[PDB]
Amino acid sequence: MGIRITGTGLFHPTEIISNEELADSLNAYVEQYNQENAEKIAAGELEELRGSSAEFIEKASGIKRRYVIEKSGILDPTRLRPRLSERSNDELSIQAEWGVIAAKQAMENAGVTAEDIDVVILACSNMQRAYPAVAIEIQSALGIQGYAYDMNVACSAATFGLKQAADAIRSGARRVLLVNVEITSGHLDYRNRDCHFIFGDVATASIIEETTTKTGFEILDIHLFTQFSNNIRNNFGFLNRSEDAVVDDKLFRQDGRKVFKDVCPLVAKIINAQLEKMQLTANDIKRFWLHQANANMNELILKYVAGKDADLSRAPIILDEFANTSSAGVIIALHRTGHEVDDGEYGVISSFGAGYSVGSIVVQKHVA
Amino acid sequence: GIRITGTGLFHPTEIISNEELADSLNAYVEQYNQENAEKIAAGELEELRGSSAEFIEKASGIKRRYVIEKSGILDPTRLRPRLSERSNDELSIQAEWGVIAAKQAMENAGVTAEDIDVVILACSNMQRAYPAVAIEIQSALGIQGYAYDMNVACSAATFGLKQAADAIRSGARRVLLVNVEITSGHLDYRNRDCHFIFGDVATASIIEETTTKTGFEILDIHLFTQFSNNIRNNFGFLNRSEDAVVDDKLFRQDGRKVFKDVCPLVAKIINAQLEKMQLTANDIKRFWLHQANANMNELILKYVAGKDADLSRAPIILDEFANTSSAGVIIALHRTGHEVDDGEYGVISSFGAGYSVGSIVVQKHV
Q: Which residues pair with B4 in a beta bridge?
């Protein structure tokens, strides 16, 4: 009791890549590859590459576009990664800069200032460097005094981060700033038709406070769950240098079919057990804020936990515009539609994905 | 009551002595300084400087360190360990070490996998971004619940202990906290002012809500961060997109500035914590401090206790392990927790990069 999400913030870069631009770009790479390797095709030595299309992407996921940090290099079929420049230690890192922008909006929405915050958690799927923690970089750019740390549970990092925020509040923290900064274009493989469309870039932030007198979503129950799986994995890391690594697996890899099979029943089972635990039915939940990877997966999970005739409207979809933003997804959804929940009504925040990880939070809105 | 009831320790097999390391770097610089003579006498590339086992020990108190693979580190044409990519079906290197340390901590604590609700990997460098290595560790141990990766570099262990307590305060029975530090994988062996600092280790700890198990009860925690570039490594996943070229993808430090900044900061945190808890420095049986610089711990101990405080109160293990980053303070607690008798108090304090400081007052219970 007494712990509320009182504000959220959102930043996305300016440039947009539509499905068609992305498909056009990969088609060119696949075409050139299949020419250059034609004799290797006819020989069965190397595997031929298959193009993609806007319809195949949208039908597979519900994604239509995504925001990206830098558009040219991603679409450039001879580059297939954003065109970025190294920054000097004296300027904000990219990740710290995005985090600060999202975080200032969360703070302004919650009506708090730097001196009001005690903890800064950077919770996301990939940190730009190991030390000093980018969370501490964000913390000091904002002028916040307390402590900060980086934390990684991939797609579920925001719901784990909310639990850790609530845990620190129970122990004495007044207010926690939770920040998720996902520059997925830095570790996505744009050569692969099966994953090149999945992810977008974004930063989100949340202010979590101990309060009974500010409007916000009070956290009622948290279920976190992990179970190791290699069905989503990125083997890039600081030991690749010492391994003299050669395997081409240093970016996002996924068996999408197995993830879909494994995670849908996992999420629904966790949500249902949580609702039972809380003496609530699915029809007491005004909004399900679900992970934003795949609208079919969401509709599936939604129709199990709720009725088959539940209104589309109760599980907001933002992935059409952002693609999958990994840990940031549920926060985007909450940021865009929390206003659709009435005073006293209930909501569910649930992330799921890599690691296998699942986090599920029951909340109830209070208006001050 | 929340209590540290077991610790565990794994280090790799091979040792590198200061003399072996100094010999190796000296081979590297004498040879480099030959390949680039037209630039030593031209002022474009500065002449590189060697060192010695004497310089190393005086600077730090370090005499040796364990490393994951010795030959490639010492080889002046390579200056980094020789490792092999493992397949996904194999325990990764970092999960493997953390498991070995975890099993020992569990055995010392008298617990099995089924007794553990949370697994935290708190260390200075994760081997990969996802799936979290903590989840690989939890799986391999057969633990149920949830796991996650957390990074505050040198202070990861004390920050991790805090999150362990928080998680227990909110319903967890028991937390396994693991620190795995393959510092040889991001150290710059070309640089005479840092190439000796770090060693490799894995440590683990069990934290429990209990009033009946022998261990160290957590009485107060104070964590602190404040951004500093005085310790930094710019290696990361965006390096490829930056088409990065600066030679800064390894550990880098301004050793003098960290010494001046950190020493008083830590003593101030400790002193303030001591006064908060109705304690004097004479009440503290043992100070388990970060294990980076023996002179730094010497000075901190005099900064908080008497000029007359005997070095027995602040155990040192960096002579054998070198600086083990987050794990260092857990090695010291593991090696000398027995030196504290029932009802006596202790202080666990790590500090370092980020500027981070974490400090914990404990009291031993039988």
A: B207, B216
Question: Residue B185: closest CA among chain A residues belongs to which residue?
Answer: A239
CA-to-CA separations, A351 to A98, A270, A327, A361, A362, in angstroms, rounded:
21, 11, 7, 9, 12
User: What technique was this entry resolved by?
Assistant: X-ray
Residue-number span of the structural domain to which B270 is assigned: 212-366
Q: Which of A168, A174, A179 is nearest to A142 (CA)?
A: A179
> Is the domain of B176 the same as that of B278?
no
The two structure tokens encoding residue B228: 């500093």
| Contact by Cβ (8 Å): B3, B215 | yes
Asked about A155 being catalytic, the answer comes back as: yes
Residue of A330, A317, A328, A324 lying closest to A11 (CA atoms): A328
CB within 8 Å: A228 and B152: no
Domain boundary among B211, B245, B268: B211
A167 and A131 assigned to the same domain: yes
- Is A148 within 8 Å of chain B by CB? yes
For B143, nearest residue in chain A (alpha carbons): A227
Looking at the DSSP assignment, which residues form a beta bridge with residue A216?
A366
Euclidean distance between CA atoms B314 and B347, whole angstroms? 10
Are residues B70 and B100 located together in one domain of the fold?
A: yes
Cβ atoms within 10 Å, residue B77: 8
Query: Which of A135, A226, A225, A212 minimizes the C-alpha distance to A176?
Result: A135
- With contacts defined as CB-CB under 8 Å, which chain B residues touch A241? 80, 185
Q: Show which of residues 161-200 on chain B sit within 8 Å of chain A, judged by CB atoms.
A: 162-163, 165-167, 169-170, 182, 184-186
Do residues B129 and B187 lie in contact, with contact meaning Cβ atoms separated by under 8 Å? no
Count helices and strands in chain B by DSSP H and E runs: 12, 13
Instruction: Give yes or no: residues A286 and A272 share one domain.
Output: yes
Give how many domains chain A has, as a whole number: 2
Distance of CA A296 to the CA centre of its chain: 17
Taking the CA of residue A357 and the nearest CA in chain B, the distance in Å comes to 8
Resolution (A): 2.1
Same domain, B250 and B316: yes
Q: Tell which B residues from 217 to 246 touch A, by Cβ distance under 8 Å.
A: 223-229, 231-238, 240-246
Interface test with A, best of B82, B137, B138, B151 (most A CBs within 10 A): B151
Separation of alpha carbons A324 and A155, rounded Å: 9
Judge if B177 and B277 occupy the same domain: no
- Put simply, whether B127 touches A (Cβ < 8 Å) is yes
